[PDB]
């Protein structure tokens, strides 16, 4: 049955793992995949969620089957993260909540659930984007289509192209845009820009698909799900996949949300038990531990504070260590300027350096990056910024 | 786009949970979704299960993915409960196992696994059987047929019918069978019988398939896994499907895995490089939390030697209930004899009843039991004996 089987190719991503793993070089410094790093070069838990877990250890009396679509206080709570606690969907019962393995799950239960249940052909997405989205589309049989979005040589959004390559969406298909912190250029739409799709949406016929993973890391909670909130607005239907693997630093405890949103709660719930059919199919019900730690932070005030605040640090200390970047490069006599990444919205640097620079990197000074020129600034820390810089000037 | 979607038609077993969250009336007795009660009807989570996660709550230092096939030492761990602590294919490292969502979660990779990288068209399962199969194997775009299996009039393996059923099974296809605890007769083939079908498998080049989730609750670990070993045994490639959330309670905790077998460790790896790809592309890595919890519990002494206890009471209170059962019935005066019940491994009561009969139950005594006169007899406890003898009395 499987002598004929071929290797399967490695993830661009996730692939950076194994190959850090066979690396017995001592100063491997690893800015592939976009985790949360502290001052001291490791991806700790937060404190929030430490309490949260003593918490459920000591009132947890149950492991029973939480139900297809998860915790509902979970869904609830996500719902008012995402539309705002007092938000027209919420109150009209317009949307539902699957509790999911991650976002990725997220990602594949509503591939699955359009391929079956729609007439959805084709899904689009950005250029550059995240490689996941179209193994994740593929895989349903859906087809994937690029849109224009980067603008390599000012690095800005090059929005005038975006709505150019768009004009080929027709009625019907997905568009999928990232909520907030764009893997991997970190440049987002600006409110205006965000009400201007929204309105090219509705009227050309898109269903909107939203990837939210990074809430929080770029202004704030709220200021990040702006865009969202603007399309919301306007949209009769939409998809949203969340994570809280960064945010809540969940990572491998696989907590996500899909949220299906109808033109009423009739449409939404015909809708959603067959949402509800594709998961019974995969998994069948989700994890409950990283959720039940969410929404217990999210659903005590003195936790919720705590956990804001944790988020807070962290997205200033990112902030910092690219503005530290920037300047040790420089410092090191840098031929480019790379002052363009302070704008940069998130965990990444995206744009200065080539396929072979990044190979050269982990080949001769053992730093991990992505093929694409991505680094993980979230990895970068007080202790390898100089020996990092110093390798970057040198391929530069 | 979500118009002309239909509801989908409610899970015989998962829906019972619905049903059962809408009726009111406080007498309801829940004998349907296959889950441990103790003698206060209540479903607990095990003092070493508990003692693991106190353990973790103060060891563990990060939450950082954990990789596509999981927790290695869990792996490992659930290798030997499944082929023995000295068995070849551990050492010749034939077997590869990856850390999955629960057992359903590891069909359903299983099943994307052999859509994609096989040319099995069809799967064959037991009828009477376990319904997920079908919805499973039908999503991953294989065809299911059903082969002979239980003798209604006798109440025994029909195993004469199960080989000419099963003669109908080209080389090429898979045929699953259940590790024990047969879901849901409860009868098992027996050691002699499990040698003559992994002859005839090997003879007629069928994919052995198992599905391992109660190791523990027919006669023990290891006396359950004999069938297994004896396909193992002869057998160059099979694929392996278990579950922990029974014999560990860890329900929704999601702790499965799945475990791919071959001729040597090079196809093994060739093949298994194609299922991560399979489970990057729907949830990317599993949830660690429950894995952590097994692979605690299985790899400290102490720990493990309360969970092989806590795993040997649960299968002395239903042994004691089902005896109990009989005896109550026979006490309430029951037209039929229901002595068989006694020879059932596992959890469930099995072929007295009809779809009509526990419709009445539900409707007129609030008993809710699966359609197909499958009761769970580890709900049942010396509280609800009496009443729910009655009701099934009244119904016969
Ligand atoms: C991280 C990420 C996700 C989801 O990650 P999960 O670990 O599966 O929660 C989805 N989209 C993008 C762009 C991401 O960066
Ligand atoms: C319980 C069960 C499974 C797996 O359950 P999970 O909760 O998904 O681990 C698989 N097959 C049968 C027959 C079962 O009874």
Same mark, same amino acid.
């Given at each position: 049955?499987?002598?004929?089987?071929?290797?399967?190719?490695?993830?661009?991503?996730?692939?950076?793992?194994?190959?850090?793993?066979?690396?017995?070089?001592?100063?491997?410094?690893?800015?592939?995949?976009?985790?949360?790093?502290?001052?001291?070069?490791?991806?700790?838990?937060?404190?929030?969620?430490?309490?949260?877990?003593?918490?459920?250890?000591?009132?947890?009396?149950?492991?029973?089957?939480?139900?297809?679509?998860?915790?509902?206080?979970?869904?609830?709570?996500?719902?008012?993260?995402?539309?705002?606690?007092?938000?027209?969907?919420?109150?009209?019962?317009?949307?539902?909540?699957?509790?999911?393995?991650?976002?990725?799950?997220?990602?594949?239960?509503?591939?699955?659930?359009?391929?079956?249940?729609?007439?959805?052909?084709?899904?689009?997405?950005?250029?550059?984007?995240?490689?996941?989205?179209?193994?994740?589309?593929?895989?349903?049989?859906?087809?994937?289509?690029?849109?224009?979005?980067?603008?390599?040589?000012?690095?800005?959004?090059?929005?005038?192209?975006?709505?150019?390559?768009?004009?080929?969406?027709?009625?019907?298909?997905?568009?999928?845009?990232?909520?907030?912190?764009?893997?991997?250029?970190?440049?987002?739409?600006?409110?205006?820009?965000?009400?201007?799709?929204?309105?090219?949406?509705?009227?050309?016929?898109?269903?909107?698909? #939203?990837?939210?993973?990074?809430?929080?890391?770029?202004?704030?909670?709220?200021?990040?799900?702006?865009?969202?909130?603007?399309?919301?607005?306007?949209?009769?239907?939409?998809?949203?996949?969340?994570?809280?693997?960064?945010? #809540?630093?969940?990572?491998?405890?696989?907590?996500?949300?899909?949220?299906?949103?109808?033109?009423?709660?009739?449409?939404?719930?015909?809708?959603?038990?067959?949402?509800?059919?594709?998961?019974?199919?995969?998994?069948?019900?989700?994890?409950?531990?990283?959720?039940?730690?969410?929404?217990?932070?999210?659903?005590?005030?003195?936790?919720?504070?705590?956990?804001?605040?944790?988020?807070?640090?962290?997205?200033?200390?990112?902030?910092?260590?690219?503005?530290?970047?920037?300047?040790?490069?420089?410092?090191?006599?840098?031929?480019?300027? #790379?002052? #363009?990444?302070?704008?940069?919205?998130?965990?990444?640097?995206?744009?200065?350096?080539?396929?072979?620079?990044?190979?050269?990197?982990?080949?001769?000074?053992?730093?991990?990056?992505?093929?694409?020129?991505?680094?993980?600034?979230?990895?970068?820390?007080?202790?390898?910024?100089?020996?990092?810089?110093?390798?970057?000037?040198?391929?530069?």
């Amino acid at each position: 049955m499987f002598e004929n089987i071929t290797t399967a190719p490695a993830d661009p991503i996730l692939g950076l793992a194994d190959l850090l793993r066979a690396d017995e070089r001592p100063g491997k410094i690893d800015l592939g995949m976009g985790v949360y790093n502290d001052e001291t070069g490791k991806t700790p838990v937060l404190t929030s969620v430490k309490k949260a877990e003593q918490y459920l250890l000591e009132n947890e009396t149950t492991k029973n089957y939480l139900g297809i679509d998860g915790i509902p206080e979970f869904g609830r709570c996500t719902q008012e993260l995402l539309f705002g606690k007092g938000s027209a969907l919420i109150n009209d019962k317009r949307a539902r909540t699957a509790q999911t393995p991650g976002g990725t799950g997220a990602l594949r239960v509503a591939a699955d659930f359009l391929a079956k249940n729609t007439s959805v052909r084709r899904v689009w997405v950005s250029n550059p984007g995240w490689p996941t989205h179209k193994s994740v589309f593929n895989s349903a049989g859906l087809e994937v289509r690029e849109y224009a979005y980067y603008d390599a040589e000012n690095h800005t959004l090059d929005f005038d192209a975006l709505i150019n390559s768009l004009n080929e969406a027709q009625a019907g298909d997905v568009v999928l845009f990232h909520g907030c912190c764009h893997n991997p250029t970190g440049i987002d739409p600006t409110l205006e820009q965000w009400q201007t799709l929204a309105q090219l949406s509705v009227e050309k016929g898109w269903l909107p698909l #939203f990837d939210f993973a990074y809430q929080g890391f770029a202004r704030g909670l709220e200021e990040d799900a702006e865009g969202l909130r603007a399309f919301a607005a306007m949209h009769k239907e939409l998809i949203v996949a969340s994570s809280y693997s960064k945010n #809540f630093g969940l990572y491998n405890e696989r907590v996500g949300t899909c949220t299906l949103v109808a033109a009423d709660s009739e449409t939404v719930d015909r809708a959603f038990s067959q949402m509800k059919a594709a998961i019974r199919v995969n998994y069948s019900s989700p994890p409950a531990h990283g959720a039940s730690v969410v929404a217990t932070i999210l659903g005590n005030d003195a936790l919720r504070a705590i956990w804001e605040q944790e988020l807070t640090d962290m997205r200033q200390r990112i902030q910092r260590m690219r503005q530290l970047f920037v300047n040790t490069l420089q410092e090191k006599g840098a031929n480019r300027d #790379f002052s #363009f990444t302070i704008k940069q919205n998130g965990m990444f640097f995206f744009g200065g350096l080539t396929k072979e620079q990044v190979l050269r990197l982990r080949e001769e000074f053992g730093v991990y990056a992505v093929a694409s020129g991505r680094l993980n600034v979230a990895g970068m820390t007080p202790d390898n910024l100089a020996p990092l810089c110093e390798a970057i000037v040198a391929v530069l």
